[PDB]
Amino acid sequence: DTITLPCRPAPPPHCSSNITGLILTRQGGYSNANTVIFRPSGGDWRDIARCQIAGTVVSTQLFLNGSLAEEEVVIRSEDWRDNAKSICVQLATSVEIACTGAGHCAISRAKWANTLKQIASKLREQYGAKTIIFKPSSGGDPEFVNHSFNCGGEFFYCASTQLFASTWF
């Protein structure tokens, strides 16, 4: 019913946040069919800072407690054809992530799939009516391969593998 994300260390319940946006990296190369693949951003802090939809919370992959869109999801990028440029996704309806306190934060499965379908809808306007696929992070250091954030001086690492594993036609 929910999407449980393994986190280290255990985020206390007061560190629950509102997911207001994502940051993605479109996988390059030559695909075999009408499929475009996206992963959590493979860049660094410069891709997150130039998004400018974040608040005071410092986070990777997912924007916590940041700017929401007015009506519908708004995706933006400096070049849609440069896979080295990240794709900034700004949600309109925040998705609440609730951390229990035993090392795992929860996310509703249906309400996350609804946001991924609206995101895949906005992505087809820039890359044509194709198949949109979300895949886990391609790797990297712990703070970027995982959904990381700060809360009260501490730094938490949450594995975001279960959040990016869907296909939308």
Partner: antibody, heavy 118, light 105 residues
Framework: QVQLVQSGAEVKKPGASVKVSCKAS????????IHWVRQAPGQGLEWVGW????????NYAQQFQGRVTMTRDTSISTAYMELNRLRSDDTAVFYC???????????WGQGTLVTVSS | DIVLTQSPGTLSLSPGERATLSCRAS???????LAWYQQKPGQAPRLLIY???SRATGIPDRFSGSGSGTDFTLTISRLEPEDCAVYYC?????FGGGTKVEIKR
């Protein structure tokens, strides 16, 4: 002056794996992405993927997703590119490149010949 | 995606004449991301032109670039015997097939 020095040539058997290094110097190693380009004998250039040395993030080409892995070591300014499960048609020369800002590859390594044969 | 078609596959020219290498894109692209390279046998590619027309440092002025939309042209005003190599055009991670410039006798 900016220069890239790669590892030496490799002779591998089909099914094995190979790891190629690329040592950078003359600039801040974490400031620019490291790309890799493949060129089969008598063929053209083919982009393999880039790596962010500051964060370790990678973006592999779809045709190489699964067999390639790119890492780095910031204390020696050396980037690595590993290709597993080699086939006979994987015999090619691998270059590491750096752009003026990203894709304007002005700095190349001398190349590393990787021949696969039994 | 973006496909870069270079023509001809092999260009033969008498020493001292003008070269004209074209790079056709399958779709309309921006000129700010068009690059040209030169690769001699046994060596790595060398950046000649970036941004469709901006010449790289150390490149002789006889190399020139122009074009927009889908057609881009690399021009060698006076072909030197040292200019015999394969030339590629680039758009992000996409490379052209390459044009071999040889001497015509």
């Amino acid at each position: 002056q900016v220069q890239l020095v790669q590892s030496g040539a490799e002779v591998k058997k089909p099914g094995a794996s190979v790891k190629v290094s690329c040592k950078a110097s003359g600039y801040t190693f974490t400031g620019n992405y490291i790309h890799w380009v493949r060129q089969a004998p008598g063929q053209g250039l083919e982009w393999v993927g880039w790596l962010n040395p500051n964060s370790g993030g990678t973006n592999y080409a779809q045709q190489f997703q699964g067999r390639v892995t790119m890492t780095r070591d910031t204390s020696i300014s050396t980037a690595y590119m590993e290709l597993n499960r080699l086939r006979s048609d994987d015999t090619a020369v691998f270059y590491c490149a750096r752009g003026l800002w990203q894709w304007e590859f002005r700095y190349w390594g001398q190349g590393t010949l990787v021949t696969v044969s039994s | 995606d973006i496909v870069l078609t270079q023509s001809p596959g092999t260009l033969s020219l008498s020493p001292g004449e003008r070269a004209t290498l074209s790079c056709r894109a399958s779709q309309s692209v921006s000129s700010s991301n068009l690059a040209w390279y030169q690769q001699k046998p046994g060596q790595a590619p060398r950046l000649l032109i970036y941004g469709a027309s901006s010449r790289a440092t150390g490149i002789p002025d006889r190399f020139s670039g122009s074009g927009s939309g889908t057609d881009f042209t690399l021009t060698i005003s006076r072909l030197e015997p040292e200019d015999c190599a394969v030339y590629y055009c680039q758009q992000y991670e996409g490379f052209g097939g390459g044009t071999k410039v040889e001497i015509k006798r």
